[PDB]
Design a binder for these strands. Structure first.
Lengths: 210, 263, 346
RNA sequence: GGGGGGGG
DNA sequence: TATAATGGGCTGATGCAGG
DNA sequence: CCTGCATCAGAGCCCAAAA
């Protein structure tokens, strides 16, 4: 009944009184220091559902990643608005990125092994330890690294560099390390005799990166 | 972990874990607060900057927000957000009406009455007429909102067996039944902790049921009997109009000791 | 401005779940229930009480009320007290609290994300006597039931399980609330059956079936008498405000007389009878009339039969039956002179 | 979102 | 209680956002 | 300030009125 009696008392328009009574909009009793779009939320302000959700529960967004495509950012990483998340995915807001469902889990297992190697003497650089990537030796001319035991070859190839393991019966008699710059001349499951070349080492040979 | 013992992924030996190919990336505007020891706030609690989160007071919150406790990542997330009080419906309005000191508003509105532009004085008058109305009368504005809804005595909305043994009933009974259902259903949805979307829908339906009972058709579509276009006759409809209570049973009546014939 | 459209707009603000997300929420809800079970044992509390306390903190301060069955009035004092005992748990126990919280959070999300399913089921049930929104709310009640009973391990999609409970909930709603005169759910089912049966019979026979034709089709136990009695029960009342045609100036209720309140004549008649009735028991003697008056009662209706009269009339007990006959006998003589009471025989 | 066959 | 099913079918009196 | 301009509540009596 216009002018609304409730409406007149509260300084609420016809539309406003409708929106609160019929659940189209919130009206704020105690802002508790909220601020929206740069201005502080003042008591008796009307909020839409979207405004209330941004205020009350915070703002967030979820971006689909094309199947098989891996993201250009890591789980937990702070992100600016506009930063590129995936080849086809661009983030719309600042905040913490969270992985939803990793399709592939890679476990890097820790291996600590004792392996031997033989090099000329004028060609090797003396160090007490070698960091990944560090130059191990420089060969004036190509050198053939030879088997020091007879056995069948168990070949284990890394990303770069290789491991080679000779065994008689099932007991490994030797563990060799082939750095980068050393090309295996034998294949897995190959029979070798003492003194035959396993790998050619040419030029500068260095620790692999991993 | 998986549904059945097979297909689980168990770590073969010592190693470190890397996550790849996520289904989607969720960007949250939030602060991350890692914790080594026990965490003292559980998830869902609301928190203000400086409030102690975990590890006996070592780690605390930088923002106002909502606690998300990640037991995998071993971190307490705080999603930036406020304890803001904002409501919908007649519940909200009844509070603001309760929170009225009419004395003060009269004072305020009188000060506005000392002002040109005529319109300022005109609107302050209309407001002041409602304020003064309540003050003299003794009515509390929050009474314009119903908590208990009255139910008219039954003989005034009868269910009677007519000649044929058939039942005839007043429309008010159907309007009340709708009301009762929605009230009862609302109580159940509350006790069962339905999401706000469901409770909001029920609450707004409840307003509509009360609205049809008091004045049907006044706001929104008129409530009708199933398979009839006839608007149900509400209390407002009963009071008013040519057929209404005043012009039919009050200002004129059928009478005894009367007759009629051709002249 | 349109309540249906608004609700449709609000549901559409929650994106639908992926198979992973659907399974994730379902998983979290199940695990959370297991967590609440464990917390009862450790704490010595009640799983329902624990469930409501966990649930209160997720929804917020907005919803706090007594829940039917809980032994304690649920108010901020008791939930602070009880929450502080849960937060008083050791690290390995206190973890179970966190599980329960996230279960309630996920339950909320799962329900909200399935609301569009309920709409698509309810729209097919329109026209049975419940409004669309009433059906949605009853349908939503079933959806809530479905989330609590869902076992995600079975690998069925959620939509598959939910649909059963929602259909059940709507159908129970329609059966319970659609009639002004409420009918037991099982009886409503039988009535609907007669309709289906009769509609077949009329479609094959090319004319309306008899009670007998329906009774055969219904099988054993059914005769025409039972078909007739069931339909009577199934008759819905009609509005007193139904216009009698003309629609301008006539209501059905205006033609219904009031049979309860006595008419002026009837009230007059009953008054006249009491006055002539007392003016008659006093004309023999009040006392042998008082004994008789005591046996029937002007106002009260004090007829036993033989015992009670053992006490206070003034005589012992066989005698009052006798003075009853002579009171009635003198009355009968006294009646032939003052034969004015004949006309009250109708 | 307000309305109709006859008699005066 | 479990294939999956996910967004409806003619007038006058008065109080208002807008040239 | 004022006007378009919108939203609401009015529209004769009694008797048959054939539902």
């Amino acid at each position: 009944d216009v002018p609304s009696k409730i409406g007149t008392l509260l300084d609420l328009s016809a539309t406003e009184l409708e929106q609160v009574l019929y659940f189209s909009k919130y009206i704020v009793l105690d802002p508790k220091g909220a601020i929206l779009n740069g201005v502080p939320v003042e008591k008796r302000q009307l909020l839409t559902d979207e405004e209330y959700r941004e205020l009350r529960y915070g703002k967030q967004e979820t971006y689909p990643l094309p199947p098989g495509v891996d993201a250009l950012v890591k789980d937990g990483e702070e992100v600016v608005k506009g930063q590129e998340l995936a080849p086809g995915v661009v983030s719309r807001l600042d905040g913490v990125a969270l992985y939803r469902f990793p399709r592939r889990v890679r476990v890097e297992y820790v291996k600590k092994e004792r392996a031997g190697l033989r090099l000329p003497l004028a060609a090797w650089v003396e160090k007490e330890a070698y960091k990944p990537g560090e130059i191990l030796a420089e060969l004036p001319e190509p050198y053939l690294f030879r088997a020091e035991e007879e056995g069948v070859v168990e070949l284990k190839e890394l990303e770069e560099g290789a491991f080679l393991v000779l065994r008689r019966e099932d007991e490994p008699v030797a563990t060799y390390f082939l750095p980068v710059g050393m090309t295996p001349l034998v294949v897995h499951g190959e029979i070798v005799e003492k003194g035959q070349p396993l790998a050619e080492a040419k030029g500068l040979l260095r620790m692999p990166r991993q | 972990a998986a549904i059945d013992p097979e297909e689980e992924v168990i770590a073969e030996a010592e190693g470190v874990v890397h996550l790849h190919e996520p289904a989607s990336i969720l960007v949250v505007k939030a602060r991350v607060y890692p914790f080594e020891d026990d965490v003292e706030v559980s998830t869902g609690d609301r928190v203000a900057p400086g409030d102690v989160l975990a590890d006996g007071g070592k780690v605390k919150s930088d923002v106002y927000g909502r606690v998300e406790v990640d037991l995998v990542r071993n971190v307490v997330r705080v999603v930036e957000s406020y304890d803001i009080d904002a409501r919908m419906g007649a519940e909200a309005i009844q509070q603001l009406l309760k929170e009225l000191d009419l004395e003060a508003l009269e004072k305020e509105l009188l000060e506005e009455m000392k002002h040109p532009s005529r319109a300022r004085r005109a609107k302050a008058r209309k407001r002041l007429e409602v304020v003064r109305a309540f003050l003299d009368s003794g009515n509390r504005p929050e009474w314009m909102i119903l908590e208990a809804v009255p139910v008219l005595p039954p003989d005034l909305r009868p269910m009677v067996q007519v000649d044929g043994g058939r039942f005839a009933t007043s429309d008010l009974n159907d309007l009340y039944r709708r009301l009762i259902n929605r009230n009862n259903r609302l109580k159940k949805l509350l006790a069962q902790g339905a999401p706000e979307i469901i409770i909001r829908n029920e609450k707004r339906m409840l307003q509509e049921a009360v609205d049809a009972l008091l004045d049907n058709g006044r706001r929104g579509a008129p409530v009708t009997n199933p398979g009839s276009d006839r608007p149900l006759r509400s209390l407002t409809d009963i009071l008013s109009g040519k057929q209404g209570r005043f012009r039919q049973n009050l200002l004129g009546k059928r009478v005894d000791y009367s007759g009629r014939s051709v002249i | 401005s349109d309540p249906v459209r608004q609700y449709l707009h609000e549901i559409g603000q929650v994106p639908l779940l992926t198979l992973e997300e659907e399974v994730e929420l379902a998983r979290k809800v199940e695990e959370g229930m297991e967590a609440i079970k464990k917390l009862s044992e450790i704490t010595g509390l009640d799983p329902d009480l624990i469930r409501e306390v966990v649930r209160a903190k997720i929804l917020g301060s907005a919803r706090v009320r007594h829940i039917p069955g809980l032994k304690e009035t649920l108010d901020p004092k008791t939930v602070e007290e009880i929450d502080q005992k849960l937060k008083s748990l050791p690290k390995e126990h206190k973890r179970y609290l966190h599980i329960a919280r996230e279960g309630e959070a996920a339950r909320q999300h799962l329900i909200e994300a399935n609301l569009r399913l309920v709409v698509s089921i309810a729209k097919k049930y329109t026209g049975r006597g419940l409004s669309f929104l009433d059906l949605i709310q009853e349908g939503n009640q079933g959806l809530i039931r479905a989330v609590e009973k869902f076992e995600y391990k079975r690998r069925f999609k959620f939509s598959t399980y939910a649909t059963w409970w929602i259909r059940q909930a709507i159908n129970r709603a329609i059966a319970d609330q659609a009639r002004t005169i409420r009918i037991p759910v099982h009886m409503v089912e039988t009535i609907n059956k007669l309709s289906r049966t009769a509609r077949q019979l009329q479609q094959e026979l090319g004319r309306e079936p008899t009670y007998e034709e329906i009774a055969e089709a219904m099988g054993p136990g059914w005769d025409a008498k039972r078909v007739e009695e069931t339909l009577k029960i199934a008759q819905e009342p009609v509005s007193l405000e139904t216009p009698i045609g003309d629609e301008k100036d006539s209501f059905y209720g205006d033609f219904i007389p009031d049979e309860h309140l006595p008419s002026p004549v009837d009230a007059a008649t009953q008054s006249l009878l009491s006055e002539e009735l007392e003016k008659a028991l006093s004309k023999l003697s009040e006392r042998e009339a008082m004994v008789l008056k005591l046996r029937k009662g002007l106002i009260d209706g004090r007829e036993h039969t033989l015992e009670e009269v053992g006490a206070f009339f003034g005589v012992t007990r066989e005698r009052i039956r006798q003075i009853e006959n002579k009171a009635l006998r003198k009355l009968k003589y006294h009646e032939s002179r003052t034969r004015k009471l004949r006309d009250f025989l109708d």
